């Protein structure tokens, strides 16, 4: 389709193996292989993600990533820098911070409520910004949270991103990762930005239990469980403070009406007991030691 030509008018022109040097593969997933690099001038280090378009197309969401992200900059988001197309590959240039994913922290260490509150505050800030600009991430999970060496928190991977409008402020595309999905998305009801709030809630369960509910099961079985069970239950709910349990239940409220939004969840008292972001850095050290 001309959808490839629409993409050819968005990207920049260049080698682009002339500016950016010092390539190192630091990742490889469904979003494509990710490299670290640096362009002459400099001294800015960058991350370059590479998709094989003529080997694993989609392909409407590909363009949607660039368009939505290039005009939505925020401190709590990995920021788009540029994009090129070479051969069959699409390259996306973005900021880089070193220091692992939240996933490595939540599956190899234990976070206290002060640390969970700091991570949640930063995430809510990114969501509150996205939602105020009619943007829904639709794939909130620890895998998509990045941790700076100074304890910074950045939302990443907007490949499943979606833009709403007052004329059609809801969606019905069954997108995201099964276990982190809101019920209204699982059961194909019309859904809004509050689905990000849900997945944030599931990600808190990660930070509490080390993994999202039903993870032992299979993706489809999980979707069924989410559909049936609705609001998931902690193995040991008593291990959480009263101010934390209230926070979770306002993130995981079945009633989309009664479920909190990012703007009002930033006002929750659970975020008041938040520790400074520097407390997250020993978790990063510990995460890297179990990773070895
Ligand atoms: C946790 O994985 C470590 C490997 N790094 C990595 N994989 C990525 C996949 C997709 C995107 C992505 C993406 C976007 O959707 C974000 C909005 C702008 C367009 C591209 C970014 C990835 N990164 C980064 C990026 C920057 N720093 C670090 N440490 N890792």
Curated annotation (Swiss-Prot):
Q: Which GO terms describe its molecular function?
A: ATP binding; collagen binding; gamma-tubulin binding; identical protein binding; protein kinase activity; protein kinase binding; protein serine kinase activity; protein serine/threonine kinase activity
Residues given in the record as ATP binding sites: 26-34, 49, 95-97
Q: Which GO terms describe its cellular component?
A: actin filament; axon; cell-cell junction; centrosome; chromosome; cytoplasm; cytosol; dendrite
Q: Which cofactor does it need?
A: Mg(2+)
Q: What is its EC number?
A: 2.7.11.1
Instruction: Describe, from its UniProt entry, the tissues in which this protein is expressed.
Output: Overexpressed in gastric cancer cells and tissues (at protein level).
Superkingdom, taxonomy of origin:
Eukaryota
Q: Where is the Protein kinase domain?
A: 20-271
Q: Name one GO biological process term.
A: intracellular signal transduction
How is this protein activated or inhibited? Activated by binding small G proteins.
Instruction: Tell me what PTMs the record reports for this protein.
Output: Autophosphorylated in trans, meaning that in a dimer, one kinase molecule phosphorylates the other one. Phosphorylated by JAK2 in response to PRL; this increases PAK1 kinase activity.
Keywords, comma-separated and alphabetical: Acetylation, Allosteric enzyme, Apoptosis, ATP-binding, Cell junction, Cell membrane, Cell projection, Chromosome, Cytoplasm, Cytoskeleton, Disease variant, Epilepsy, Exocytosis, Intellectual disability, Kinase, Membrane, Nucleotide-binding, Nucleus, Phosphoprotein, Serine/threonine-protein kinase, Transferase
Q: Where in the cell is it found?
A: Cytoplasm; Cell junction, Focal adhesion; Cell projection, Lamellipodium; Cell membrane
> What does the subunit section of this Swiss-Prot or TrEMBL entry state?
Homodimer; homodimerization results in autoinhibition. Active as monomer. Interacts with GIT1. Component of cytoplasmic complexes, which also contains PXN, ARHGEF7 and GIT1. Interacts with NISCH. Interacts with DVL1; mediates the formation of a DVL1, MUSK and PAK1 ternary complex involved in AChR clustering. Binds to the caspase-cleaved p110 isoform of CDC2L1 and CDC2L2, p110C, but not the full-length proteins. Interacts with ARHGEF7. Interacts tightly with GTP-bound but not GDP-bound CDC42/P21 and RAC1. Interacts with SCRIB. Interacts with PDPK1. Interacts (via kinase domain) with RAF1.
**Annotated disease:** Intellectual developmental disorder with macrocephaly, seizures, and speech delay: An autosomal dominant neurodevelopmental disorder characterized by impaired intellectual development, poor speech, postnatal macrocephaly, and seizures.
Q: Which family does it belong to?
A: Belongs to the protein kinase superfamily. STE Ser/Thr protein kinase family. STE20 subfamily.
Q: What is this protein called?
A: Serine/threonine-protein kinase PAK 1
Q: Which organism is the protein's source?
A: Homo sapiens
Span covered, complete protein: 251 to 542 of 545
């Amino acid at each position: 389709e001309e959808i490839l030509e629409k993409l050819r008018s968005i990207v920049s022109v260049g080698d682009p193996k002339k500016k950016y040097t010092r390539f190192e593969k630091i990742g490889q997933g469904a979003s494509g292989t990710v490299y670290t690099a640096m362009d002459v001038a400099t001294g800015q280090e960058v991350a370059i993600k590479q998709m094989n378009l003529q080997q694993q197309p989609k392909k409407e969401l590909i363009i949607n990533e660039i368009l939505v992200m290039r005009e939505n900059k925020n401190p709590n988001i990995v920021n788009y820098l540029d994009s090129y197309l070479v051969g069959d590959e699409l390259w996306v240039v973005m900021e880089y911070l070193a220091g692992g994913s939240l996933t490595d922290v939540v599956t190899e260490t234990c976070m206290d409520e002060g640390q969970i509150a700091a991570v949640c505050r930063e995430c809510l800030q990114a969501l509150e910004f996205l939602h105020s600009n009619q943007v829904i991430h639709r794939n909130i999970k620890s895998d998509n949270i990045l941790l700076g060496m100074d304890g910074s928190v950045k939302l990443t991977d907007f490949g499943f991103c979606a833009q709403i409008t007052p004329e059609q402020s809801k969606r019905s595309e069954m997108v995201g990762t099964p276990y982190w999905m809101a019920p209204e998305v699982v059961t194909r009801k019309a859904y809004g930005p509050k689905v990000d709030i849900w997945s944030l809630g599931i990600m808190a369960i990660e930070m509490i239990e080390g993994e999202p509910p039903y993870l032992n099961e299979n993706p489809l079985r999980a979707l069924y469980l989410i559909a049936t069970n609705g609001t998931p239950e902690l193995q040991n709910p008593e291990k959480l403070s009263a101010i934390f349990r209230d926070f979770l239940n306002r993130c995981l409220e079945m009633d989309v009406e009664k479920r909190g939004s990012a703007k009002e969840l930033l006002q929750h008292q659970f975020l008041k007991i938040a520790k400074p972001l520097s407390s997250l850095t020993p978790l990063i050290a510990a995460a890297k030691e179990a990773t070895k």
